[PDB]
Ligand binder design. Structure first.
Ligand SMILES: C[S@@+](CC[C@H](N)C(=O)[O-])C[C@H]1O[C@@H](n2cnc3c(N)ncnc32)[C@H](O)[C@@H]1O
Ligand SMILES: [Zn+2]
Ligand SMILES: [Zn+2]
Ligand SMILES: [Zn+2]
Lengths: 250, 11
């Protein structure tokens, strides 16, 4: 079982494919984070604009030496390189070509549909941004529902991104003690956005994974099936954390 | 406590 990302656009066909076990269970697809209604501008880079001949010669706009990129800030529409700017990947949704696949023991997963060079933007981790009090409410709800999969991302020093009910296909990225992706915290238009990026050349067909650095507050630990010869055993490690520490409250 | 559950962390 395998399905490309444009399969998730028709919710009726998606829902019916899911009833047949060929697609994962329905969730609300979103293109950008949804906040729970909480929600002079010039952060230009210093790249000298590419001439229209340089464009024609293959030069990159806002490449590796772009001051915005080097600080993990995306350029805006006003970037000196304009339409050429290659540092608007989150905003333009310039994702890697990936598929959602069914794994043996971890539920559904993400695999590369073509070779991805190292340091390649995979997908943004989108979800609902929760404050600490809605986080606790969802902890209770997901526990009482007896969910198996959890989808809480805790950006360091920041609110939880919950992709359990709304998100994109990045919510399928499984954990590995020996991963081939990393998260990267980027700012787009003053807002934090978290992206998955490759850390090595991922060959076509390989599962994409990252290190959850998972913080378990559940009583019962989850054995890790990443299969790495240096596998840490359980998703959460040896010790359980409180609910407030898991949610990043000191 | 909840039976299962946890939070992923970037770092
Ligand atoms: C962010 S979800 C990833 C998508 C999920 N596999 C699904 O089918 O919806 C994380 C959940 O997937 C499972 N999972 C991910 N990586 C795992 C691993 N290495 N070993 C065991 N379970 C894993 C656990 O159930 C965890 O709660
Ligand atoms: Zn630039
Ligand atoms: Zn730019
Ligand atoms: Zn492991």
């Amino acid at each position: 079982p395998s399905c490309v990302m444009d399969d998730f656009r028709d919710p009726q066909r998606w829902k019916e494919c899911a009833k047949q076990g060929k697609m994962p269970c329905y969730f609300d697809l979103i293109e950008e984070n949804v906040y729970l209604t909480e929600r002079i501008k010039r952060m230009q880079c210093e790249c000298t604009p590419l001439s229209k001949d340089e464009r024609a010669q293959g030069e990159i706009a806002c490449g590796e030496d772009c001051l915005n990129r080097l600080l993990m800030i995306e350029c805006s529409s006003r970037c000196p390189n304009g339409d050429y700017c290659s540092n608007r990947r989150f905003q333009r949704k310039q994702h890697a070509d990936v598929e959602v696949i069914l794994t043996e023991k971890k539920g559904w997963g993400l695999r590369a549909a073509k070779d991805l060079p190292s340091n390649t933007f995979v997908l943004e981790y989108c979800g609902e941004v929760l404050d600490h009090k809605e986080f606790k409410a969802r902890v209770k709800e997901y526990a009482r529902n007896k969910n198996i999969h959890y989808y809480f991302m805790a950006p360091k020093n920041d609110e939880i991104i919950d992709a359990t009910q709304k998100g994109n296909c990045s919510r399928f990225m499984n954990h590995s003690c020996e991963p081939n992706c990393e998260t990267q915290k980027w700012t787009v238009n003053g807002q934090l956005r978290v992206g998955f990026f490759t850390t090595k050349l991922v060959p076509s067909g390989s599962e994409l994974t990252f290190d959850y650095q998972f913080q378990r507050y559940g009583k019962e630990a989850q054995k890790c099936f990443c299969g790495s010869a240096n596998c840490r055993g359980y998703l959460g490690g040896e010790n359980r954390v409180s609910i407030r520490a898991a949610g990043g409250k000191m | 406590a909840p039976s299962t559950g946890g939070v992923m962390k970037p770092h």
